[PDB]
Amino acid sequence: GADGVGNSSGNWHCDSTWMGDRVITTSTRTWALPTYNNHLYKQISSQSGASNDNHYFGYSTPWGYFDFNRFHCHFSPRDWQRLINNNWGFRPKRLNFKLFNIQVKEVTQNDGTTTIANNLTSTVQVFTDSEYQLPYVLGSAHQGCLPPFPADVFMVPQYGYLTLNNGSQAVGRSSFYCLEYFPSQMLRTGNNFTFSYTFEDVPFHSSYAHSQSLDRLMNPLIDQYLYYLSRTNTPSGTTTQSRLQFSQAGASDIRDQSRNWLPGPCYRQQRVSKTSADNNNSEYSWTGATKYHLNGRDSLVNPGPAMASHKDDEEKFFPQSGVLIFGKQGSEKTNVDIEKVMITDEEEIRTTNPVATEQYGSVSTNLQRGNRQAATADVNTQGVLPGMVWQDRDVYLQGPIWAKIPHTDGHFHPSPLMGGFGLKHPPPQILIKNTPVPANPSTTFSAAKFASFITQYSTGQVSVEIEWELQKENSKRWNPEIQYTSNYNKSVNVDFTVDTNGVYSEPRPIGTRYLTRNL
Amino acid sequence: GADGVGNSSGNWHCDSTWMGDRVITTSTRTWALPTYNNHLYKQISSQSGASNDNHYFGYSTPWGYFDFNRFHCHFSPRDWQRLINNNWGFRPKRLNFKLFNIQVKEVTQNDGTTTIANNLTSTVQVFTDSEYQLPYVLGSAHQGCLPPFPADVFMVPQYGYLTLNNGSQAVGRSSFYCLEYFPSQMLRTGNNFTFSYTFEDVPFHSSYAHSQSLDRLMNPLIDQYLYYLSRTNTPSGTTTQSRLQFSQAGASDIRDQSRNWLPGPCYRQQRVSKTSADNNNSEYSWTGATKYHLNGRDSLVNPGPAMASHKDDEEKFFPQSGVLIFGKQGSEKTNVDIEKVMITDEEEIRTTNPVATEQYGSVSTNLQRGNRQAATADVNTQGVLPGMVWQDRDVYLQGPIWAKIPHTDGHFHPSPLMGGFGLKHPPPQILIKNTPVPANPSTTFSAAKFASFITQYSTGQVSVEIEWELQKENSKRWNPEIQYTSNYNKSVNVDFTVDTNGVYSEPRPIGTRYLTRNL
Amino acid sequence: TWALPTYNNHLYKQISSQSGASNDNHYFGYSTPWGYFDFNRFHCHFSPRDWQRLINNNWGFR
């Protein structure tokens, strides 16, 4: 840091600049940090009797952490539109981080009034691990983001983690991390903190949608030179006999043509409808779910593999867990009606990824003979096969930007299943805490742990700046594209704006896929 | 080679040196080489009536070969412990090979006595293919290793191979290799042989175990912002109606949370117990096995894909073939009791790879409607899907170090299924033979193949030195690790030591995974 | 992190054994307002895991 109590440690920077090829964004927010857990660590675990699936064991810490991982932190609704309408892809490159204008307040709750005053000599300490030595919590899509709207103020969320358990009990291999055991940087009023970071090379995210379905790749005018088996028998006299005929596949045969490629893999979902009348009356929620089984307990696959949500001309149906779901403004935690949630749509991927609610295809179950008749069965789960292409899941406007790839001997197509960018060395976790200030010890000496501290909290401003790389488009498409538009009719409230009471709200999910490409 | 009959061609080197980052090992053994097959090639094949699975066709040769491929050759039980306790991974780099102190003996069996004497002018010839032109036998985990204990003496195993067959009969494509048709190096007493080799780049083997299970990646304190479908219906009056409610997943919901990753693939096994009372009474061995079907015959998958052996708090069960199994000292070939075998345990991989005896998960089989009710089925086999992470199988103390990757147009995650390091250009096979010495031909000329030779054999010392690369650990774990310890109680015999009759024995399998890492 | 009280109301005092006591338990001395820092125990310096690249891996330390 630098200088005094009266001097300011940083300016407010929130802006976006568009350079053409690479583009830069900036934002600044205001935060407040409480003391958590009365300055002490605690182990936490599952509560008494619980399902074998719900057991957990871990620790909670006094430390907080910053999360900018959602897009809406970085991009405004309009800045989001020089991106998704005008471009075929984007990726991050490098970022900056800064804290400044730190001030610490102590509070006195005596009687029915609470007085608050500056504590000028108190400190707040911050570090960034950057060696990836801690359990990495970010990327699990928790709350506690920097707000989407720059004028809002937010608390910093508390930090904690989980470790191997057996039931509600720990195992010998289970690990315990003390955050005090790292070098950090102690800051007072008039001290600031910075670091900078560089993304590893990662593929552009695909903001295009395809103009060709994988099942139609070819010229309708010209027939193939390959033959397929067409008729298996022919009438002879009164009744048929076995005769094999072959054919070349034309535009009337398009079903039957040879191809060089296959659709992507599927792991199948249950289908439900937004119209309440079509759905069965029972509780199938947990029973009818698709799950995976790991170490004797069952977990839902909430996003699951990337698959189209519905087929043509059914907009009413979506996979049970297969989609992301966002809440509207002020929605509650539990048991809330469908009118409150916002359900995203995965469609444009129909052309490669198969629909999530249907089988991959059909396969032959048996060997035919004279007295046996051919039999097939549906394959509801398919792994990856050579010659198989697919697309990934869209990032939308608000959702995960990145995730940390687990450190393991093998992995396949690491792009993460919620969306965004898989990173082996992602942006490091930033951790922050209030330094404990003891209160009025006894006159005689005693060896005991202090239970008594001054009650205080801190606040300041944080800033983030990321540099993005863009991919422009050369398209010879003659006719116009599909663009993201706001409706021009009159309305009581404007979208993406404060209401009369001053609560900013986001009307609908906005994906990145509009501009079209050929497959 | 160099110099004389009286001069020695090499010193005994067996040692281990630890440099920190890289590390170097050395060993020397004493061998004896018989003449095989009376100096001639023979075709071999399956015997008369046999199962269609058991047919084979091939050749056996007079040549022998050296196999150091097991770890216990290179590492002593204590040297194995500055490795597995102190490190997160290791890989080979380069090796040396040497033969020396060669001496050839001829034997005379007349009457009831056998005299043995030096033959000073006889030769022994050796070559290393290194162009990978021969069938590559090593890596199939046969017998004939350099002994684990440096004072033992061993024969060199005989060399042979197999080729395409139809039943017990050869096919036109089947190949025949004459080892005489290579350049080799002929050695007498006072001649030595050397070559050196460099491993291609290969990933470190993972000697860590994970401190986090893949099903728990996230902060218990903070709720997600995503919604999952929670209740499918609500009571209305006397009976329920269809109503869809949604929820955000907290620490009580941990079963239901969204995740960016999925567990590794499985190919399922039958489960048996070490307690003899739980197992069914019948012969299910071959019938209840998991198999693959190639060209009309069936083969067991003995190791199979890497999967955890058992779940929490069942130590009694293991997959039917799914684990490696080692014999104790002096165990016989066939039909031996469980008390004689040593069964390895694959557990620490519970956190990623699914258990081998259970299904991967459940998937939805049908489309619901008003009068239809949701249906699911177990998926017992899963291929690789995008966003899937796993671990490989552990090497232990004694077992394959490497295998040769087959030469093919495609392969996936080549790490071999017994364990160790897949190599496209592995250490080349060393081949050795006694040169035939004819005996006393007839006085008149005859054109015929000699059936009569001097009876002789050779012996000497061999040496191997490998350089290893190590990966140290930076861990902020506060509490202690799990280490490999010998029990301190008194006992009749010390582990990994000679008994009163002088037979070295190994009490238990020792894996490499102790130190812990975060996932 | 430490906290330092004022001891003895900013003044020195002589202290000694209390009245009747065993001849073994008699003592005479002084107490001061001053405090002092003690790091002399190992567990201050070494964590349980750091203690294990030491005692398992080594024949001595100073």
UniProtKB/Swiss-Prot annotation, chains A, B:
Biotechnology: AAV capsids serve as viral gene transfer vectors that have been shown to affect long-term gene expression and disease correction with low toxicity in animal models, and are well tolerated in human clinical trials.
Subcellular location: Virion; Host nucleus, Host nucleolus
Name of protein: Capsid protein VP1
Organism listed in the record: Adeno-associated virus 2 (isolate Srivastava/1982) (AAV-2)
Membrane spanning stretches: none
Further facts: The ratio at which VP1, VP2 and VP3 proteins are synthesized in vivo is about 1:1:10, which is the same as in the mature virus particle.
GO cellular component assignments: host cell nucleolus; T=1 icosahedral viral capsid
Written domain comment of the UniProt record: The N-terminus of VP1 is sequestered within the mature capsid. It contains a phospholipase A2-like region and putative nuclear localization signals.
Keywords for the protein's UniProt record, in alphabetical order: Capsid protein, Clathrin-mediated endocytosis of virus by host, Host nucleus, Host-virus interaction, T=1 icosahedral capsid protein, Viral attachment to host cell, Viral penetration into host cytoplasm, Viral penetration via permeabilization of host membrane, Virion, Virus endocytosis by host, Virus entry into host cell
Its job: Capsid protein self-assembles to form an icosahedral capsid with a T=1 symmetry, about 22 nm in diameter, and consisting of 60 copies of three size variants of the capsid protein VP1, VP2 and VP3 which differ in their N-terminus. The capsid encapsulates the genomic ssDNA. Binds to host cell heparan sulfate and uses host ITGA5-ITGB1 as coreceptor on the cell surface to provide virion attachment to target cell. This attachment induces virion internalization predominantly through clathrin-dependent endocytosis.
Family label: Belongs to the parvoviridae capsid protein family.
